[PDB]
Amino acid sequence: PAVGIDLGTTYSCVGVFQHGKVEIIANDQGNRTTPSYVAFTDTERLIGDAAKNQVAMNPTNTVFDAKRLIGRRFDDAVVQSDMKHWPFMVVNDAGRPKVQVEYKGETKSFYPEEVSSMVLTKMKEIAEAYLGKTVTNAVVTVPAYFNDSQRQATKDAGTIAGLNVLRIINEPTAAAIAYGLDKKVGAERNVLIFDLGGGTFDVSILTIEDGIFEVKSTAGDTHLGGEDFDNRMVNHFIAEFKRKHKKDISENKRAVRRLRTACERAKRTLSSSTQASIEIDSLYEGIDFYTSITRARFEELNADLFRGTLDPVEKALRDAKLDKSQIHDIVLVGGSTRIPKIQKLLQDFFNGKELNKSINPDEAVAYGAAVQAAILS
């Protein structure tokens, strides 16, 4: 048995190719993704949903976004910039960063591959729990733009987990293989992979000829995703509250939370029907917030951000010296591409051209890694 693991920034996912069909193994909690979270608490260490869920109670010893630190040096523009926004401690141990935590009363320090080895250990377990066998061999994916150092730090992060990493594979190639774009014959095809998750955005252009892949260019926005979209809604509703009820709820962390949470959920609903209702009882100072939102209004709150996504598309076409009519295939991954106006912009931008999207976008990377781990098996 060999697995494909999509090791992501916010979530990880693990799959196995069995009985001629891929299976996205579910966790001990029944979820097909597992947050890449690791908490340290007085008595135990927590990974996945257990860690995600006590992040309010222990925000200072609950680590996440370790993919943003992996393989980088302490002075990397990105280690520096992100550090400002993490409750936990990032520490310069001799030019290489470390996360230091409180864990059983003793303060311990951790390299990022140590912290990614824990997510990988858990994913290994998730599979071994499902398959009722030992799992060792894996494919683990990384973004196309990762360098040697960051590939090595990931590969090690697995070798530490007890994994036999058969291969490290680019996420947009994982998704290409998922869609069997690598079994098309004859002439070289150019493939654009649009990855829009919750917090990060990545465009990747690859050429594929005869099932041999090559990375042509990299683009993206490293702080754009579904979360910017929920914020647009939170502002629309906070204004709407102030209107009808002349109150400002925004300095009440809990009212805003109840609202955020209802906004992300409403957002998901708007990808499949044309409006979405919200009732939040006694939201602020005793007042009920009963409201509703159409898709068209949601689209308008985000109209600039939805378009803004086409720039990494252009900028990546630039750097790959390709005209948009030369793109043979478009592949959508990351759970935000489920938003229809986003698919509509992209289809219309690429002059009516179809989109490859039938595989679950959250899962497609892990799908292709598992398909591929099977061949290398």
Active centre residues (catalytic)? 6, 67, 171, 195
Binding letters toward ligand 3FD, positions 193-212, x by CB under 6 A: ----xx--------------
Instruction: Please list the alpha-helical segments (H only) found in 189-252.
Output: 226-245
Q: How many CB atoms lie within 10 A of CB 163?
A: 23
Q: Which of 12, 61, 271, 302 binds ligand 3FD (CB under 6 A)?
A: 271
CB of 123 to ligand 3FD, least distance (A): 15
Residue 231: exposed, middle, or buried by beta-carbon count in 10 A (0-12, 13-18, 19+)?
middle
Q: Which of 1, 6, 11, 158 binds ligand 3FD (CB under 6 A)?
A: 11
Q: Which is nearer to ligand 3FD, 52 or 216 (CB)?
A: 52
Considering the rule CB under 6 A, would residue 267 count as an interface residue with ligand 3FD?
A: yes
Q: Where does this chain touch ligand 3FD (CB under 6 A) — which range of 56-64, 262-270, 278-286, 308-316?
A: 262-270
Q: Which residue from 316, 315, 363 is spatially nearest to 337, judged by alpha carbons?
A: 363
Q: Where does this chain touch ligand 3FD (CB under 6 A) — which range of 149-157, 160-168, 266-274, 346-354?
A: 266-274
Considering the rule CB under 6 A, would residue 231 count as an interface residue with ligand 3FD?
A: no
Q: Which residue from 282, 277, 279 is spatially nearest to 247, judged by alpha carbons?
A: 282
Q: Which residue from 343, 253, 280 is spatially nearest to 306, judged by alpha carbons?
A: 343
CB of 166 to ligand 3FD, least distance (A): 26
Question: CA–CA separation, 191 vs 163, rounded Å?
Answer: 31
- Annotated ligand binding at 377? The verdict is no
Considering the rule CB under 6 A, would residue 31 count as an interface residue with ligand 3FD?
A: yes
Q: Which is nearer to ligand 3FD, 2 or 339 (CB)?
A: 339
Residues 344-363 that bind ligand 3FD (CB under 6 A): 362
Helix (H, G, I), strand (E, B) or coil at 25: coil
Residue 72: exposed, middle, or buried by beta-carbon count in 10 A (0-12, 13-18, 19+)?
buried
Considering the rule CB under 6 A, would residue 182 count as an interface residue with ligand 3FD?
A: no
CB of 158 to ligand 3FD, least distance (A): 22
Greatest pairwise CA separation for the chain in angstroms: 67
- Annotated ligand binding at 261? The verdict is no
Contact 330, 353 (CB under 8 A): yes
Question: CA–CA separation, 48 vs 34, rounded Å?
Answer: 5
Total residues at interface with ligand 3FD (CB under 6 A): 17
Classify the phi-psi angles of 184: left when phi > 0, otherwise alpha if psi is within -120 to 50, otherwise beta.
beta
Q: What's the Rg (C-alpha) of the chain?
A: 22
Chain positions contacting ligand 3FD, by CB under 6 A: 11, 31, 33, 197-198, 225-227, 264, 267-268, 271, 335-336, 338-339, 362
The binding site for ATP consists of: 8-11, 67, 198-200, 264-271, 335-338
